[PDB]
């Protein structure tokens, strides 16, 4: 649905940048992408980015909670938001005729909140509950433990905040995070749309009429260099006897930053191991009977984490670990390096192609690209880079990141 090149960016005199990319279709995804998340927090305000996201959604003056509900129910404006370790967005997916109401609400909520003790305190329980829910998905739990033992720095915080943190978050903290991270210069408004650029631009201008320009530009709190991350491999085991005859396991390595020449290779290697699904497993895996497998690799400022995880029966856990290590090893062998690269490259192209049919997916990618990249990377240039990636690029990623490196490991066991 996207014709595989380039977005168009304009800046309003109030300093809001409006980035749109053209798409065919009835559908439009739009909103605000802000460089706000748990990487930019410290021990004392951990959890606050996510907390703020909730408050923002709980309505402001011109739109209380009630008028937001009405807008879902009758006027077809569905508000989505989320907070990762690195970024935050508030968005809606709409029909083109709903443009003005959408840009109005979104600008109002994100850029014009009313952060009062009563909404803050009233939100606490919701966030507590969400934290309980999330803690009963062991994949989430193990993900988080693996970060925690690998990073002494802010990446090792959970996104939601520790239980104690969620309990101690004050209205002052929520205010401050908004004041420091939600400014024109730390965000973009994004639109994936058939409508021309200028129509979105004019709509956002109408919508942001209340917003006064910034007098100065104090160095962004979201700056990567104010949050240098330090990976240190660690090994830690947990009980959860309610799991019964099962264990979860995760194995982590440091991964490259988003701009490293070795990033793409890292993506190829992870992809080639990939995930085991109902009908598909990596040629690299010797025991295809393993219960499950996931592979992720993320950039975090200067650092990043590649992680492999799943669950097996207690009897099968230690085997699972051997399988995963073998599989990685297999890639480095000269009998295999070339097939590994081509299959990994194919995987990455295939993940791409799927993301290019949903405006929601295009939006998220465009938002993150703009906020997290040095220079905007085209779907175009990206393809070139993948294709130009050779056996020696893979060999080199292995050298800097894998061979002779200790991995982090977390086990969560039912009996052990």
């Amino acid at each position: 649905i996207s014709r595989y090149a380039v977005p168009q960016i304009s800046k309003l005199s109030n300093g809001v940048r409006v980035a749109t990319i053209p798409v065919i279709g009835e559908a439009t995804t739009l909103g605000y992408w802000i460089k706000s998340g748990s990487m930019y927090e410290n021990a004392s305000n951990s959890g606050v980015s996510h907390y703020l996201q909730h408050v923002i959604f709980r309505g402001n003056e011109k739109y209380p909670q009630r008028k937001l509900e009405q807008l879902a129910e009758y006027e077809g404006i569905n508000l989505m938001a989320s907070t990762s370790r690195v970024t935050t967005n508030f968005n809606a997916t709409i029909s083109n005729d709903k443009l003005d109401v959408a840009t109005d609400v979104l600008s109002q909520l994100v850029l014009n909140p009313r952060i009062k003790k009563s909404i803050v305190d009233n939100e606490r329980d919701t966030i507590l509950a969400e934290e309980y829910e999330v803690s009963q998905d062991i994949n989430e739990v193990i993900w988080d433990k693996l970060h925690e033992i690998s990073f002494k720095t802010s990446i090792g915080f959970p996104i939601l905040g520790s239980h104690q943190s969620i309990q101690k978050i004050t209205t002052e903290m929520v205010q401050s995070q908004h004041s420091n991270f939600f400014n024109q210069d730390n965000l973009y408004f994004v639109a994936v749309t058939s409508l021309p650029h200028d129509v979105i631009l004019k709509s956002v201008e109408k919508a942001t009429q209340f917003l006064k320009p910034l007098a100065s530009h104090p160095k962004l709190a979201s700056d990567n260099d104010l949050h240098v991350q330090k990976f240190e491999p660690n090994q830690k085991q947990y009980l959860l006897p309610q799991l019964g005859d099962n264990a979860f396991v995760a194995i982590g390595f440091e991964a490259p930053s988003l701009d490293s020449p070795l990033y793409i290779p890292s993506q190829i290697v992870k992809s080639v191991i990939g995930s085991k699904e109902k009908y598909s497993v990596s040629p690299l895996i010797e025991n295809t009977n393993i219960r499950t497998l996931n592979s992720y690799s993320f950039p975090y400022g200067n650092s990043g984490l590649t992680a492999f995880f799943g669950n097996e029966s207690i009897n099968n856990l230690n085997g699972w670990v051997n399988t995963i290590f073998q599989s990685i090893g297999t890639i480095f062998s000269n009998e295999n390096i070339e097939g590994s690269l081509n299959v990994g490259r194919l995987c990455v192209k295939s993940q791409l192609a799927r993301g290019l049919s949903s405006t929601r997916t295009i939006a998220d990618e465009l938002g993150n690209n703009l906020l997290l990249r040095n220079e905007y990377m085209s779907l175009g240039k990206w393809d070139e880079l993948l294709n130009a990636t050779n056996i020696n690029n893979i060999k080199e990623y292995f050298d800097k990141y894998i061979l002779e490196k200790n991995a982090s490991m977390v086990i969560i066991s039912g009996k052990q």
Binding site: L243, Y279, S280, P283
Partner: protein, 393 residues
């Protein structure tokens, strides 16, 4: 959509829309009811599917996303891929339509996965609702055959249904797979079989699937594994009916959530009640409107009373509510689902026309004819079903 009929009688149905991801598949009137017992069909088609793809490694290496959906009266297979994988996808679809029984060793593997379905996260609440509705609201006892075996029970390979697939297959695919499918269907034998498929009559039976749930389901320590599920079924209409939009609307009025009337009066109303949802299930010739409640075993009767209280409430319903409902109402999978049923796809321009076009007449009419019946009552758990049934008079 673009219908065709082939030289040899084979129907072929194409999804319009953009290029990028390629789609192919087969849909056919063989479902779980066409095997002697639960899981028989499921495991047979799974075995056949896994042999057809050669190995999970081939699947992976070509980046093919296979999907197999076995329903009561019908089933479908879909494959999604990038254009450079066309040959493997087409050949794998061909092998699937070749009538040959899968080797026992494969069956035994698939049996293992099937028995472990709840633990692996393949047997969620949606799947349990369907099972509960199908073992309770049919005059025919064959509808009680689901896809997921009980721990105590046998599962056998059904080689006859494999011979039958090619003889009743409609082919489905994205528009750009026209040429490739025309040739594939070309290879199937003339002419497709024609059976009369009549969905079984409504019966308000009372049943229990009184079975332990796994603690761990997929990667979740299930927050519902100790609670019971109560399914209440009433007859509605077939997918092709002109009343089907009215019923979709009626389901959203009832609505529901976890932690709309089912939310407010039922999830709010019984403390220690995880969730309450109303769904509308279509079949070849009939429907089942069903309301499902996850609550403590001892709380089910109270919950039923709140649902009866809830049905009552729908007569005196405002236009604010009646507009919210109209509002509130792997896209290939919907194209295929709605291609068999012969209706309009949930995403199509024509379907959302219908939803705008439902009168208040239509809704109260649908309500009246549906709730005129004594509900069928099923329990995932030990709750006495006739007790809950008593609530309805």
């Amino acid at each position: 959509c673009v219908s065709s009929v082939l030289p040899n009688g084979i129907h072929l149905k194409l999804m319009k829309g953009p290029r990028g991801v390629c789609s192919i598949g087969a849909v056919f009137p063989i479902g779980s009811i066409n095997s002697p017992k639960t899981a028989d069909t499921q495991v047979t088609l799974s075995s056949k599917l896994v042999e057809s793809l050669i190995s999970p490694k081939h699947v992976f290496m070509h980046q093919v996303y296979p999907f197999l959906q076995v329903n009561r009266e019908y089933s479908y297979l879909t494959l999604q891929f990038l254009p450079e994988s066309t040959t493997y996808a087409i050949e794998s679809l061909k092998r699937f339509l070749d009538g040959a029984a899968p080797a026992n060793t494969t069956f035994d593997q698939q049996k293992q996965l099937n028995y472990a379905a709840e633990q692996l996260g393949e047997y969620n609440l949606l799947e349990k609702y369907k099972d509960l509705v199908c073992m309770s609201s049919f005059s025919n006892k064959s509808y009680a055959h689901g896809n997921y075996a009980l721990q105590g029970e046998k599962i056998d390979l059904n080689p006859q249904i494999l011979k039958e697939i090619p003889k009743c297959t409609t082919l489905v695919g994205s528009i750009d797979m026209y040429e490739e499918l025309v040739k594939l269907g070309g290879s199937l034998s003339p002419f497709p079989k024609v059976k009369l498929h009549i969905t079984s009559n409504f019966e308000p039976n009372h049943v229990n699937k009184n079975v332990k749930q796994s603690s761990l389901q997929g990667s979740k320590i299930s927050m519902t594994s100790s609670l019971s599920i109560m399914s209440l079924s009433w007859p509605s209409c077939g997918a092709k009916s002109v009343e089907a939009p009215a019923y979709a609307v009626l389901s959203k009025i009832f609505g529901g959530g976890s932690e709309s009337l089912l939310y407010t009066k039922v999830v709010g109303g019984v403390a220690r009640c995880h969730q309450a949802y109303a769904y509308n299930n279509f079949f070849t010739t009939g429907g089942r409107f069903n309301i499902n409640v996850v609550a403590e075993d001892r709380n089910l009767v109270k919950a039923a009373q709140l649902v009866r209280e809830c049905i009552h409430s729908v007569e005196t319903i405002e236009d604010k509510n009646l507009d919210a409902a109209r509002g509130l109402v792997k896209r290939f999978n919907e194209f295929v689902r709605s291609s068999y049923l012969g209706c309009k796809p949930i995403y199509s321009s024509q379907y959302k026309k219908s939803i705008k076009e439902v009168t208040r007449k239509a809704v109260e009419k649908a309500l009246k004819q549906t709730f005129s019946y004594k509900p069928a009552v099923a329990v995932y758990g030990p709750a006495v079903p006739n007790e809950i049934a008593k609530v309805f008079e």
